[PDB]
Amino acid sequence: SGRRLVIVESPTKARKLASYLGSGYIVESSRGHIRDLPRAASDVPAKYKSQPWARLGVNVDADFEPLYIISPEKRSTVSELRGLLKDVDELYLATDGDREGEAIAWHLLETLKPRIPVKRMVFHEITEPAIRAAAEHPRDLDIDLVDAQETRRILDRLYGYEVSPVLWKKVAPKLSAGRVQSVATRIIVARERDRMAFRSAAYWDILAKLDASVSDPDPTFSARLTAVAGRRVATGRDFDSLGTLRKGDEVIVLDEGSATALAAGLDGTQLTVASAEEKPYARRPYPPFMTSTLQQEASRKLRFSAERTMSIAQRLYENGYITYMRTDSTTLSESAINAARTQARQLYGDEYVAPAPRQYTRKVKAQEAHEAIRPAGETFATPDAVRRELDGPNIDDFRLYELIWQRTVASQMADARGMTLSLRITGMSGHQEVVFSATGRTLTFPGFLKAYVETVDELVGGEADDAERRLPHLTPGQRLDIVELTPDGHATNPPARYTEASLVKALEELGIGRPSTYSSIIKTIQDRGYVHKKGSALVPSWVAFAVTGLLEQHFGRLVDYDFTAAMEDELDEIAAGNERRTNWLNNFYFGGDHGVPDSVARSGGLKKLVGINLEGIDAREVNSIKLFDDTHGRPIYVRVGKNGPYLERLVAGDTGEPTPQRANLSDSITPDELTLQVAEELFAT
DNA sequence: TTCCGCTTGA
């Protein structure tokens, strides 16, 4: 008697809250969800097995009623939870305040079925004021929120389990499609096709080593040719992806024979500065690590895949070193802000800390389930003590901890305010007015850069955030002697493939996926054979091409990049009480007036889509990846057959034509690396 | 066969 049962999701927070509430409360953890739809037919209860909609696990013929069963892993969890329910007087459902957390609370309600008072609450900070205010001010279970979550789960089931069989019939069995993984696959595939249709273009100019004597004699820097007789010399940005000069007849593309000619055209010219401006910049510090940015920076700076970053992060959180690592917020508490303030003032002095309270709040709804990943506690464990506490076969724990520490303290520092030079020289070579340009820049005060520097992407490349290129000053009209002129030839480059970091940043930017499943999408798309990793680059497979093509050509809307965003727009309306749970579900599955013109509801419903497309999809066409024509104009295809992928071409044979010529490809040749020359070598032997 | 999402030890 007098005891209270408090259920939260994570055992760590369960132990903390138990410590700060003491006797008369027994705090336990549900470990996330405890029930779900049946994964496969085996998970369907027997007297529901011959139900026509059992393969879906959703009664779609009667207001989309889900068949919820207890997850076999969480069975013991619920056994103890039910038993423990018997010696308390009240039950505090204290899952997190988000949509899935409310749904979990409702599932606990349905599974425990308590006869005692229940109170719904959400604990933010683990302190006596916050916990007291959370317990003394309970609220009701948000059935609109639970309904929105149910709509999300049901849509993802109908999508995955109705579209995937189409893939089994048209492409190959055991293959999968889904709202998130199919769009990730389509992102990678689309970038690869961009790489296949890319045609590089060549363009020259001149690079110059210059000195500074006659200017203000207070010594070797570089410059590049920029304009010829009032006409800019072409650079990589001036060509489209087909090598065509981009919509501009006001640019001249130099070649070797010309660049050398001007290089020797006038070596004795005194270069005369023409125009010069000064540009100071004030760049604000980086927000603290959330799941996405921590995975990206741990990938680019420490070479950790998303999965490993999450393993190490899990150990660091469960052992008390860092805050919860599955989050989508960059806000901090006053305690963390002041902690990073004191550490920054300590290691970098009082002149390198932020003058104004740097708070990095986002824009979504206020109901922040979690906050940014930070070193846990009122005081930050020093990275040296962490260094000696973590040693053995896993120093990576300390490495990622050092990352999170340095980023977090960097978040509450003053801005960096360097300065860049815009140096424009002019002259004449031959008889033509030539314009040279150059840009260097130095950091006056590194600020937060003294603690944290973001790492440029590996395949994308670019200038570092703290990069500095120094050079002497100059005045308008000052003279400059040409030390050396050397011609330089460049070519345009195809767009870069995605790394795990850039893929994750992409998905996040589209508002798809979540902090808990980012690494899971990558694992999934690799496991289904859609994506394989070459170095750090994500390379799509041929059957990824076939699947992706089927999806955009017959289930287009379902793989639109903003599908997820429109869905979220609908579910927000469900959660606000503006729309009913099965209103848009009925519209989406069976058809009707609803949403954008391209919506599945307008197109007649997902059911009608799968029904007519399961009969009228050319499997040959879906499994024939159009590449290019040969030199005789005969098309060349990558056909994905039961024995793997083979390169096919229709040939003129003995008694005329047509006859297939085939040559199957080892998976070691990426799609873009297969040119026509490669294709006819493979066709040869 | 197949989904997304929440969370840890199977």
Give chain A's domains with CATH numbers.
1-147 (3.40.50.140), 148-196+495-605 (1.10.460.10), 197-284+415-494 (2.70.20.10), 285-414 (1.10.290.10)
- Start-to-end CA distance of chain A, whole Å, equals 83
Output phi, psi for A188, to 5 deg: -60, -45
Q: Which two tokens stand for residue A505?
A: 């940043």
A368 is in an annotated binding site: no
- The whole-angstrom separation of Cα A241 and Cα A199 is 6
User: Going by DSSP bridges, is the β-strand pair A4-8/A90-93 parallel, antiparallel, or unpaired?
Assistant: parallel
DSSP three-state, residue A175: coil
Which positions of chain B lie under 7 Å from any protein Cβ? 1-9
- The H or E element that residue A146 is part of is helix A143-170
Residue A16 in tokens = 């903390």
Please tell me which residue in A324, A401, A452, A518 is annotated as part of the active site.
A324
Method by which this entry was solved: X-ray
Asked whether the beta carbons of A126 and A20 are under 8 A apart, the reply is yes
Tally of CB atoms within 10 A around A490: 14
Residue with smallest Cα–C1' gap to B4: A156
Q: Is A97 left (phi over 0), alpha (psi -120 to 50) or beta?
A: alpha
Rounded to an integer, what distance in angstroms lies between the CA atom of residue A69 and that of residue A45? Answer: 8
Phi, psi dihedrals of residue A178, rounded to the nearest 5° = -170, 160
Burial class (CB within 10 angstroms; exposed 0-12, middle 13-18, buried 19+) of A350: exposed
List the A443 CA – B8 C1' distance (angstroms).
46
Nucleotide nearest to A159 (CA to C1'): B3
Query: Helix, strand, or coil here: A571?
Result: helix
Instruction: Supply the DSSP string of A60-73, one letter for each residue.
Output: TTTTTEE--EE-ST
Distance A77 CA to B10 C1' (A): 13
Separation between the CA of A154 and the C1’ of B3 (whole angstroms): 9
User: What b/e sequence results for A374-386 when a residue is b if at least 16 CB atoms lie within 10 Å of its CB, and e otherwise?
Assistant: bbbeeebbebeeb
> Residue A523 — φ and ψ, nearest 5°?
-55, -45
Compute how many other C-beta atoms are within 10 angstroms of the C-beta atom of residue A340: 27
CA-atom Rg of chain A in angstroms = 31
Find out whether A152 and A517 touch, Cβ atoms under 8 Å.
no
Residue labelled with tokens 């499943």 = A517
A293/A593 Cα distance (integer angstroms): 39
Task: Provide long-range contacts, Cβ within 8 A and 24+ apart, for A522-526.
Answer: A522/A184, A522/A305, A522/A306, A522/A307, A523/A307, A524/A176, A524/A181, A525/A181, A525/A184, A525/A185, A525/A188
Residue partners of A132: CB distance under 8 A and separation at least 6 = none
Within 10 Å of residue A303's Cβ, how many Cβ atoms? 10
Q: Is A92 a catalytic residue?
A: no
Q: Is A411 in contact with A287 (CB distance < 8 Å)?
A: yes
Report whether A325 contacts A317 (CB < 8 A): yes
User: What resolution in angstroms, rounded to 1 decimal?
Assistant: 2.4
What Cα–Cα distance (Å) separates residue A375 from each residue in A50, A335, A402, A601, A683?
Answer: 53, 11, 10, 47, 59
A419, A442 in Cβ contact below 8 A?
A: yes
A156 has binding-site annotation? no
